[PDB]
Short mmCIF file of C-alpha atoms and ligand atoms in Angstrom, two decimals:
data_model
loop_
_atom_site.label_atom_id
_atom_site.label_comp_id
_atom_site.label_asym_id
_atom_site.label_seq_id
_atom_site.Cartn_x
_atom_site.Cartn_y
_atom_site.Cartn_z
CA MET A 1 -10.00 -0.99 -4.40
CA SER A 2 -11.90 -2.84 -1.03
CA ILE A 3 -13.49 0.46 -0.77
CA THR A 4 -17.21 -0.31 -0.13
CA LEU A 5 -20.52 1.69 0.23
CA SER A 6 -23.32 0.97 2.37
CA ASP A 7 -26.65 -0.14 1.24
CA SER A 8 -28.19 3.59 2.37
CA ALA A 9 -24.43 5.25 0.74
CA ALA A 10 -25.37 3.94 -2.80
CA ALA A 11 -28.42 4.59 -2.49
CA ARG A 12 -28.10 8.59 -1.81
CA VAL A 13 -25.52 8.45 -4.17
CA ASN A 14 -27.78 7.20 -6.57
CA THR A 15 -30.47 9.33 -5.90
CA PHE A 16 -27.95 12.20 -6.23
CA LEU A 17 -27.12 10.88 -9.91
CA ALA A 18 -30.43 10.26 -10.76
CA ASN A 19 -31.92 13.78 -9.96
CA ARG A 20 -28.44 15.48 -11.45
CA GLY A 21 -29.90 13.76 -14.60
CA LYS A 22 -25.86 12.84 -15.58
CA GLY A 23 -22.83 11.67 -14.44
CA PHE A 24 -20.29 8.61 -14.33
CA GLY A 25 -20.57 8.50 -10.62
CA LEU A 26 -18.46 9.08 -7.25
CA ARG A 27 -14.94 10.71 -6.28
CA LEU A 28 -13.81 9.69 -3.06
CA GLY A 29 -10.63 12.34 -2.21
CA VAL A 30 -8.78 13.71 0.93
CA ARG A 31 -7.44 16.98 1.80
CA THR A 32 -5.07 18.72 4.63
CA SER A 33 -7.62 20.07 7.46
CA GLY A 34 -5.20 21.82 9.54
CA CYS A 35 -1.62 20.96 10.55
CA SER A 36 -2.24 17.61 11.97
CA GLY A 37 -5.34 16.30 10.16
CA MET A 38 -7.29 15.20 6.98
CA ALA A 39 -10.69 15.76 5.52
CA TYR A 40 -12.62 13.33 3.38
CA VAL A 41 -13.67 14.39 0.02
CA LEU A 42 -17.05 13.63 -2.24
CA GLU A 43 -17.61 14.87 -5.54
CA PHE A 44 -19.13 13.95 -8.56
CA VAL A 45 -17.25 12.88 -11.43
CA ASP A 46 -18.17 12.79 -15.28
CA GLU A 47 -14.70 12.15 -16.85
CA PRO A 48 -12.49 9.97 -14.70
CA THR A 49 -8.71 11.52 -15.32
CA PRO A 50 -5.75 9.01 -16.50
CA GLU A 51 -4.63 9.55 -13.05
CA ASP A 52 -7.65 7.73 -11.69
CA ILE A 53 -8.59 4.04 -10.63
CA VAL A 54 -12.10 3.48 -11.35
CA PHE A 55 -14.01 0.80 -9.37
CA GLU A 56 -17.22 -0.44 -8.61
CA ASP A 57 -20.01 -1.37 -5.12
CA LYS A 58 -23.35 -1.69 -5.26
CA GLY A 59 -23.43 -0.48 -9.08
CA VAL A 60 -21.88 2.89 -8.30
CA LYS A 61 -18.72 3.54 -9.95
CA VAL A 62 -16.13 5.05 -7.61
CA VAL A 63 -13.22 7.37 -8.95
CA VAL A 64 -10.07 7.77 -7.07
CA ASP A 65 -6.78 9.63 -7.66
CA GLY A 66 -4.33 6.90 -7.70
CA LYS A 67 -2.09 8.81 -5.21
CA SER A 68 -5.22 9.25 -3.30
CA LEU A 69 -5.92 5.08 -3.19
CA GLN A 70 -3.08 4.93 0.02
CA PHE A 71 -5.64 7.21 2.21
CA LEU A 72 -8.74 5.29 0.98
CA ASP A 73 -8.46 1.94 1.03
CA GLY A 74 -10.55 -0.18 3.81
CA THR A 75 -13.12 2.96 3.43
CA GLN A 76 -16.50 1.95 4.11
CA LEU A 77 -18.53 5.02 3.25
CA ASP A 78 -21.85 4.70 4.90
CA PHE A 79 -25.09 7.51 4.99
CA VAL A 80 -26.31 7.57 8.55
CA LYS A 81 -28.94 10.20 9.88
CA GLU A 82 -28.10 10.80 13.76
CA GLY A 83 -30.29 13.47 15.79
CA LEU A 84 -31.01 16.79 13.34
CA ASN A 85 -28.05 15.52 10.96
CA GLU A 86 -27.96 13.08 8.34
CA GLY A 87 -24.88 12.57 5.88
CA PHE A 88 -22.07 10.37 4.57
CA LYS A 89 -19.59 8.74 7.06
CA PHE A 90 -16.39 7.18 6.53
CA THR A 91 -15.33 4.11 8.31
CA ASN A 92 -12.10 2.29 8.32
CA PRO A 93 -11.63 -1.06 10.49
CA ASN A 94 -8.21 -0.35 11.33
CA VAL A 95 -8.93 3.25 12.49
CA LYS A 96 -10.18 3.90 16.03
CA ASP A 97 -12.03 7.04 17.66
CA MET B 1 -2.50 2.98 -10.12
CA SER B 2 1.40 4.45 -11.16
CA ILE B 3 1.09 1.33 -13.13
CA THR B 4 2.31 2.42 -16.70
CA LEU B 5 3.03 1.35 -20.23
CA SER B 6 5.07 1.92 -22.38
CA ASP B 7 4.69 3.09 -26.27
CA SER B 8 5.71 0.08 -27.74
CA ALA B 9 3.82 -2.54 -24.98
CA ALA B 10 0.27 -0.18 -25.44
CA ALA B 11 1.19 -0.66 -29.57
CA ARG B 12 1.44 -4.24 -28.99
CA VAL B 13 -2.01 -4.71 -26.41
CA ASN B 14 -3.62 -2.30 -29.30
CA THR B 15 -2.22 -4.69 -31.99
CA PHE B 16 -3.58 -7.62 -30.11
CA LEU B 17 -7.18 -5.87 -29.49
CA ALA B 18 -7.39 -4.89 -32.98
CA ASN B 19 -7.22 -8.32 -34.34
CA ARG B 20 -9.06 -10.03 -31.60
CA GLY B 21 -12.02 -7.60 -33.26
CA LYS B 22 -13.39 -7.06 -29.41
CA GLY B 23 -12.54 -6.61 -25.61
CA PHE B 24 -11.85 -4.14 -23.14
CA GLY B 25 -8.33 -4.35 -22.48
CA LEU B 26 -5.82 -5.76 -20.89
CA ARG B 27 -5.67 -7.75 -17.29
CA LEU B 28 -2.65 -7.62 -14.97
CA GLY B 29 -2.25 -10.47 -13.05
CA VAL B 30 0.03 -12.35 -10.85
CA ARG B 31 0.47 -16.05 -9.55
CA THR B 32 2.62 -18.10 -7.09
CA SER B 33 5.92 -19.76 -9.15
CA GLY B 34 6.94 -22.44 -6.57
CA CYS B 35 7.98 -21.77 -2.95
CA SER B 36 9.74 -18.90 -3.16
CA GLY B 37 8.29 -16.71 -6.42
CA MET B 38 6.03 -14.92 -8.26
CA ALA B 39 4.69 -14.77 -12.05
CA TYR B 40 3.01 -12.14 -13.85
CA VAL B 41 -0.20 -12.74 -15.89
CA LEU B 42 -1.43 -10.79 -18.66
CA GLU B 43 -4.60 -11.52 -20.03
CA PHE B 44 -7.25 -10.28 -21.99
CA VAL B 45 -10.33 -8.33 -20.16
CA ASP B 46 -13.97 -8.60 -21.53
CA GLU B 47 -16.00 -7.48 -18.26
CA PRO B 48 -13.99 -6.23 -15.36
CA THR B 49 -15.18 -7.71 -12.16
CA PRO B 50 -16.80 -5.84 -9.02
CA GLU B 51 -13.54 -7.07 -7.80
CA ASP B 52 -11.42 -5.27 -10.35
CA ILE B 53 -9.73 -1.86 -9.95
CA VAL B 54 -9.57 -0.48 -13.41
CA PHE B 55 -6.94 2.47 -15.12
CA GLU B 56 -5.45 3.92 -18.38
CA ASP B 57 -2.11 4.45 -20.04
CA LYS B 58 -1.81 5.46 -23.28
CA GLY B 59 -5.67 4.44 -24.24
CA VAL B 60 -5.19 1.34 -22.73
CA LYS B 61 -7.67 -0.19 -20.32
CA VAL B 62 -5.36 -1.87 -17.53
CA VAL B 63 -7.68 -4.40 -14.89
CA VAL B 64 -6.25 -5.61 -11.73
CA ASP B 65 -8.05 -7.46 -9.06
CA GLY B 66 -8.07 -5.20 -6.11
CA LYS B 67 -6.28 -7.69 -4.07
CA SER B 68 -3.20 -8.01 -6.53
CA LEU B 69 -2.66 -3.95 -6.26
CA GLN B 70 -0.40 -4.17 -4.04
CA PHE B 71 2.43 -6.57 -5.60
CA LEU B 72 1.84 -4.62 -8.95
CA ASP B 73 2.05 -0.81 -8.14
CA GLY B 74 5.10 0.91 -9.75
CA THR B 75 5.18 -1.88 -12.67
CA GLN B 76 5.86 -0.76 -16.34
CA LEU B 77 4.62 -3.08 -18.53
CA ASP B 78 7.46 -2.51 -21.88
CA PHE B 79 7.86 -4.66 -24.81
CA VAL B 80 11.09 -5.81 -25.90
CA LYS B 81 13.05 -7.60 -29.17
CA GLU B 82 16.24 -9.18 -27.42
CA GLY B 83 18.06 -11.70 -29.89
CA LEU B 84 14.92 -14.10 -30.85
CA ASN B 85 12.66 -13.42 -28.16
CA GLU B 86 10.40 -10.67 -28.24
CA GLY B 87 7.94 -10.18 -25.59
CA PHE B 88 6.82 -8.14 -22.50
CA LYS B 89 9.00 -6.89 -19.73
CA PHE B 90 7.74 -5.83 -16.37
CA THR B 91 9.96 -3.70 -14.45
CA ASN B 92 9.35 -1.80 -11.59
CA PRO B 93 12.00 0.64 -10.10
CA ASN B 94 11.99 -0.44 -6.57
CA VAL B 95 12.77 -3.71 -7.48
CA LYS B 96 16.78 -5.11 -8.72
CA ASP B 97 18.48 -7.67 -10.36
CA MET C 1 4.20 -5.49 8.81
CA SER C 2 1.18 -8.30 8.44
CA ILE C 3 4.04 -10.36 7.90
CA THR C 4 3.91 -13.50 9.90
CA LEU C 5 6.04 -16.64 10.46
CA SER C 6 4.83 -19.70 11.27
CA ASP C 7 6.10 -22.10 14.26
CA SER C 8 8.29 -23.60 12.11
CA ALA C 9 9.73 -21.16 10.33
CA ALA C 10 10.41 -18.89 13.35
CA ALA C 11 12.62 -22.27 14.93
CA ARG C 12 14.50 -22.71 11.80
CA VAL C 13 15.30 -18.71 11.64
CA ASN C 14 15.75 -19.33 15.33
CA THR C 15 18.03 -22.42 14.72
CA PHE C 16 20.21 -20.51 11.92
CA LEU C 17 20.89 -17.29 14.43
CA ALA C 18 21.80 -19.26 17.26
CA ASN C 19 24.30 -21.52 15.43
CA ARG C 20 25.59 -18.47 14.08
CA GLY C 21 26.32 -17.27 17.29
CA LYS C 22 25.12 -13.66 16.32
CA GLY C 23 22.77 -11.75 14.45
CA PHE C 24 19.92 -9.39 14.38
CA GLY C 25 18.17 -11.23 12.68
CA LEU C 26 15.96 -11.85 9.20
CA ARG C 27 15.96 -9.87 6.05
CA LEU C 28 12.98 -10.67 3.75
CA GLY C 29 13.83 -9.18 0.03
CA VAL C 30 12.48 -9.20 -3.12
CA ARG C 31 14.23 -9.26 -6.91
CA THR C 32 13.32 -10.17 -10.34
CA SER C 33 13.26 -13.35 -11.75
CA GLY C 34 13.17 -12.95 -16.02
CA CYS C 35 11.10 -10.71 -17.39
CA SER C 36 7.75 -11.59 -16.04
CA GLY C 37 8.40 -13.05 -12.75
CA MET C 38 9.69 -11.88 -8.96
CA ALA C 39 12.10 -14.11 -6.47
CA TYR C 40 11.63 -13.90 -2.77
CA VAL C 41 15.11 -13.44 -1.12
CA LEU C 42 16.24 -14.44 2.93
CA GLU C 43 19.40 -12.91 4.31
CA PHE C 44 20.63 -12.41 7.78
CA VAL C 45 21.01 -9.23 9.31
CA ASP C 46 23.46 -7.66 11.37
CA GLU C 47 22.19 -4.10 11.24
CA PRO C 48 19.45 -2.51 9.66
CA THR C 49 19.55 0.38 7.41
CA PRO C 50 18.02 3.41 7.34
CA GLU C 51 15.84 2.70 4.48
CA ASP C 52 14.73 -0.75 6.27
CA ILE C 53 11.35 -1.14 8.50
CA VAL C 54 11.81 -3.42 10.93
CA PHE C 55 9.00 -5.76 12.54
CA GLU C 56 8.15 -9.07 15.16
CA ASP C 57 6.91 -12.26 14.82
CA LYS C 58 7.40 -14.92 17.51
CA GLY C 59 10.63 -13.27 18.93
CA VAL C 60 12.50 -12.91 15.06
CA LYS C 61 13.50 -9.57 13.93
CA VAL C 62 12.72 -9.70 10.52
CA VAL C 63 13.71 -6.49 8.48
CA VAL C 64 12.11 -5.49 4.82
CA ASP C 65 13.82 -2.49 2.78
CA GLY C 66 10.70 0.09 3.08
CA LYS C 67 10.62 0.00 -0.79
CA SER C 68 9.93 -3.72 -0.67
CA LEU C 69 7.30 -3.74 1.90
CA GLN C 70 4.79 -3.56 -0.58
CA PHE C 71 5.68 -6.30 -2.78
CA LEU C 72 6.26 -8.63 0.67
CA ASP C 73 3.12 -7.32 3.14
CA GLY C 74 0.71 -10.10 3.81
CA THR C 75 3.49 -12.88 3.66
CA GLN C 76 3.09 -16.00 5.68
CA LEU C 77 6.52 -17.51 5.47
CA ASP C 78 6.59 -21.08 6.33
CA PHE C 79 9.17 -24.12 6.67
CA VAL C 80 8.37 -27.50 5.48
CA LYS C 81 9.23 -30.82 4.65
CA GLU C 82 8.13 -32.16 1.02
CA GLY C 83 9.48 -35.52 -0.26
CA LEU C 84 13.60 -34.98 0.02
CA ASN C 85 13.07 -31.20 -0.07
CA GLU C 86 12.85 -29.17 2.94
CA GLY C 87 12.59 -25.20 2.92
CA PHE C 88 10.95 -22.00 3.12
CA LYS C 89 7.87 -21.21 1.56
CA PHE C 90 6.20 -17.81 1.03
CA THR C 91 2.65 -18.02 1.02
CA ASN C 92 0.53 -14.92 0.89
CA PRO C 93 -3.63 -15.39 1.04
CA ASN C 94 -4.22 -12.92 -1.82
CA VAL C 95 -2.30 -14.72 -4.31
CA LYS C 96 -2.78 -18.17 -6.02
CA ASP C 97 -1.27 -20.97 -7.72
CA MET D 1 8.80 3.47 5.57
CA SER D 2 9.56 6.48 3.60
CA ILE D 3 8.27 8.94 6.44
CA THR D 4 10.72 11.47 7.10
CA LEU D 5 11.84 14.25 9.84
CA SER D 6 12.96 17.67 8.80
CA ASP D 7 15.68 18.52 11.26
CA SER D 8 13.71 20.64 13.38
CA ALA D 9 11.16 17.89 14.37
CA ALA D 10 14.30 15.11 14.90
CA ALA D 11 15.94 17.87 17.21
CA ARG D 12 12.40 18.32 18.77
CA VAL D 13 11.64 15.07 19.23
CA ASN D 14 15.40 14.47 20.35
CA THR D 15 15.10 17.48 22.70
CA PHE D 16 11.52 16.03 24.23
CA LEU D 17 13.30 12.65 24.84
CA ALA D 18 16.52 14.10 26.62
CA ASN D 19 14.22 16.05 28.98
CA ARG D 20 12.02 12.87 29.86
CA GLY D 21 15.24 11.23 30.12
CA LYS D 22 14.32 8.07 28.87
CA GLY D 23 12.20 6.32 26.03
CA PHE D 24 12.63 4.51 22.51
CA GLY D 25 11.20 6.91 20.41
CA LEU D 26 8.37 8.43 18.29
CA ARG D 27 4.93 6.83 17.95
CA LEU D 28 3.15 8.24 14.75
CA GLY D 29 -0.60 7.36 15.28
CA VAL D 30 -3.67 7.98 13.45
CA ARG D 31 -7.77 8.65 14.37
CA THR D 32 -11.04 9.86 13.41
CA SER D 33 -11.87 13.30 13.75
CA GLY D 34 -15.35 13.78 12.98
CA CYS D 35 -17.47 11.64 10.15
CA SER D 36 -15.25 12.23 7.42
CA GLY D 37 -11.99 13.33 9.33
CA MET D 38 -8.57 12.12 10.44
CA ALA D 39 -5.98 13.25 13.06
CA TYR D 40 -2.45 12.55 12.93
CA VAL D 41 -1.19 11.65 16.47
CA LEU D 42 1.84 11.95 18.26
CA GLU D 43 3.36 9.94 20.92
CA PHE D 44 6.39 8.72 23.39
CA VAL D 45 7.36 4.91 22.73
CA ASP D 46 8.81 2.71 25.75
CA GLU D 47 8.13 -0.71 24.32
CA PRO D 48 6.83 -1.45 20.59
CA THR D 49 4.32 -3.96 20.00
CA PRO D 50 4.78 -7.12 18.29
CA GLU D 51 1.97 -5.00 15.63
CA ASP D 52 4.18 -1.94 15.46
CA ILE D 53 6.49 -1.52 12.87
CA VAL D 54 9.85 0.71 13.60
CA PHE D 55 11.99 2.70 11.25
CA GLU D 56 14.68 5.12 11.52
CA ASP D 57 15.40 8.99 10.02
CA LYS D 58 17.57 11.59 11.81
CA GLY D 59 18.22 9.01 14.97
CA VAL D 60 14.82 9.23 15.83
CA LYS D 61 13.03 5.41 16.17
CA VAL D 62 9.50 5.88 14.76
CA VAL D 63 6.80 3.57 15.72
CA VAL D 64 3.87 3.08 13.35
CA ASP D 65 0.96 -0.18 14.07
CA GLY D 66 1.40 -1.84 11.02
CA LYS D 67 -2.33 -1.46 10.05
CA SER D 68 -1.71 2.79 10.26
CA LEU D 69 1.12 2.45 7.76
CA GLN D 70 -1.16 2.58 4.72
CA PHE D 71 -2.31 6.13 5.90
CA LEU D 72 0.74 7.52 7.05
CA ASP D 73 3.38 6.46 4.14
CA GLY D 74 5.18 9.57 2.57
CA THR D 75 4.57 11.96 5.61
CA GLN D 76 7.32 14.34 6.14
CA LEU D 77 6.78 15.44 9.92
CA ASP D 78 8.22 19.27 10.33
CA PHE D 79 8.31 21.40 13.18
CA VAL D 80 7.45 24.93 12.34
CA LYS D 81 6.63 28.36 14.09
CA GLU D 82 3.87 30.20 12.72
CA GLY D 83 2.90 33.59 14.33
CA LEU D 84 2.42 32.75 18.25
CA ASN D 85 2.27 29.00 17.11
CA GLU D 86 4.70 26.37 17.33
CA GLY D 87 4.06 22.95 16.35
CA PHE D 88 4.24 19.85 14.13
CA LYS D 89 3.16 19.39 11.03
CA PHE D 90 2.70 16.70 8.85
CA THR D 91 2.70 16.98 5.04
CA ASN D 92 2.58 14.39 2.24
CA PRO D 93 3.42 15.23 -1.42
CA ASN D 94 0.13 13.25 -2.12
CA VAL D 95 -2.13 15.83 -0.67
CA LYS D 96 -3.71 19.15 -1.27
CA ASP D 97 -4.77 22.36 0.51
HG1 HG E 1 1.24 24.45 12.79
HG1 HG E 2 9.34 -25.55 -0.50
HG1 HG E 3 11.87 -10.62 -22.46
HG1 HG E 4 -22.23 12.07 10.34
#
């Protein structure tokens, strides 16, 4: 859906996919982290399940379990460098720090 | 998403697609009908737009504009024969007659 | 939710509520119209059910069954005069004519 | 919406509200925890904002910012005792450990 990727995230994903030499694209998932928390998940996809929803931003195929689409919509996946750390960052306008 | 197709609807769509000789699959859309009304729309898709979400039920590729996904989720597309009329019927558990 | 009312719709509802002499506010609902269609519904509410969601725009209490919230979100209820007809009009940005 | 409370959570919330001696009810909120994470938030509400959605389970008024409703729907708020720890636990069927 209105899940998007920044230029740097799409480059990064496409880099992983090119070095891997295969793959359909990118899974965005969600999981519990504790009793009052959620963790975002990134995985490679080779084959979408019949439960998956598939879309496109910046020529990247993003795959999301249909059930997880509620928690993920509005997400911008970015890829940022902060100090010694470099990595993906999920943003959502309608969520605060 | 948890949009599904009955056996008869999937047969029917697959029949249209086979006779057409080409096509990716099925677009579900939505449009206004009047001042307090909505009409469901069926179309063939050849190429999904970057705004589209794509999923699968019964080997049929269903394509929905990401913005329309709110109004369509939970829909069962059926294909029924009633009297002299034969045609698609959209059902949703959470909607009444 | 991000269901809103124009000034004219809120005036109109508030007029009905004042003339009625009682009532909590406004129910927005949804129902089938045919085999591929939906009809928007307006009703007065006196008591929200435990299944209802309640919100506020322009000092009007709007009540929506929680299950119907998917089809109604993003709606602007307006109240318009066109020719000899005067009445409520449901709009949604993400829906076309 | 189809946000619910277990018996123990509703008792616990009602206990806090009775000891506080005032208050409308319970705010469920959401916030970032890191770069790929979310944290659930519980607060007392005295006055719902015009941006809030309000509902009811077990005689508890639950208030949610309309924008946060996407991430929170399907949540069961429970209140559990595990070892030395006792506290609220958010569950969602469509989310895994
Ligand atoms: Hg816990
Ligand atoms: Hg009208
Ligand atoms: Hg029909
Ligand atoms: Hg980071």
